Amino acid sequence: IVGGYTCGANTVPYQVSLNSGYHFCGGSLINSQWVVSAAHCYKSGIQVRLGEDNINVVEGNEQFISASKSIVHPSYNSNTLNNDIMLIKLKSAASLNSRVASISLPTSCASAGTQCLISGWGNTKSSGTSYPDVLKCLKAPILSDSSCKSAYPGQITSNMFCAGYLEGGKDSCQGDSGGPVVCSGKLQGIVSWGSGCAQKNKPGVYTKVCNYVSWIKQTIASN
Ligand SMILES: CS(=O)(=O)c1ccccc1-c1ccc(NC(=O)c2cc(C(F)(F)F)nn2-c2cccc(CN)c2)c(F)c1
Numbered sequence: 001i002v003g004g005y006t007c008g009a010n011t012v013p014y015q016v017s018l019n020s021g022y023h024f025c026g027g028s029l030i031n032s033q034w035v036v037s038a039a040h041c042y043k044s045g046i047q048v049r050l051g052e053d054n055i056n057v058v059e060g061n062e063q064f065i066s067a068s069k070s071i072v073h074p075s076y077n078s079n080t081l082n083n084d085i086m087l088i089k090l091k092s093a094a095s096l097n098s099r100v101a102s103i104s105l106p107t108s109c110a111s112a113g114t115q116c117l118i119s120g121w122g123n124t125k126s127s128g129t130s131y132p133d134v135l136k137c138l139k140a141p142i143l144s145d146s147s148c149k150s151a152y153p154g155q156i157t158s159n160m161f162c163a164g165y166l167e168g169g170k171d172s173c174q175g176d177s178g179g180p181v182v183c184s185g186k187l188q189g190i191v192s193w194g195s196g197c198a199q200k201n202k203p204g205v206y207t208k209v210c211n212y213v214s215w216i217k218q219t220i221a222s223n
Pocket residue numbers: 078079080081123155171172173174175176177191192193194195196197198203204205
């Protein structure tokens with residue numbers, strides 16, 4: 001997160017950290033056994049870390065659970081980043097509490113202007129790289145599709161939306177990928193991609209979760 005603020009220990013209870021000897025992506029807990037992340041975050045040997053704040057120090061509320069299965073959307077295209085969503089099943093259910101909770105799936109899509117909370121342990125610099133120890137937050141609005149497509153001619157599909165600031169300075173960045181975009185208590189997006197970070201006229205692009213609600217539910221029901 002570039003130009004954001006320190007969330008505060010466990011203030012984003014649904015935020016998870018995907019770990020493989022180091023933090024490489026974020027994710028969202030949608031129920032006791034399932035996490036939603038980005039398809040391009042996929043890899044083997046994934047350990048899901050819940051109830052995290054400072055990802056480098058054991059503080060007391062962490063729950064480390066191995067992924068028993070990772071389901072990348074069958075129509076995910078790595079060349080266009082279309083359908084950039086993945087479901088991860090935990091080996092055992094997580095113990096839900098005040099510091100570890102699930103986030104609700106949307107029942108309808110969000111509209112332009114809607115204010116959302118984006119979080120992650122991603123890079124905090126627009127120029128160069130420097131990762132934080134604690135979880136970072138950023139409040140950002142969903143932009144109109146016109147502005148989104150004007151910024152990224154020919155690269156925006158109906159399964160993506162832009163959110164952020166055209167003036168630059170505040171944006172999600174590498175390391176935030178797979179993380180949540182919550183609006184009015186609903187997970188509306190997944191950190192996917194963007195041209196650099198916090199760059200002018202280059203807002204972040206996010207996976208439009210509302211288009212995948214049926215797919216998600218039918219998939220977890222079958223696994
Ligand atoms: C495969 S294509 O290029 O032909 C391509 C083809 C078609 C559609 C989309 C892409 C595409 C473009 C840029 C990127 N690059 C990034 O998305 C990125 C870079 C960095 C850093 F290197 F740090 F500059 N961070 N970063 C990023 C990560 C998460 C969120 C956000 C948001 N602000 C940005 C990417 F992956 C995919």
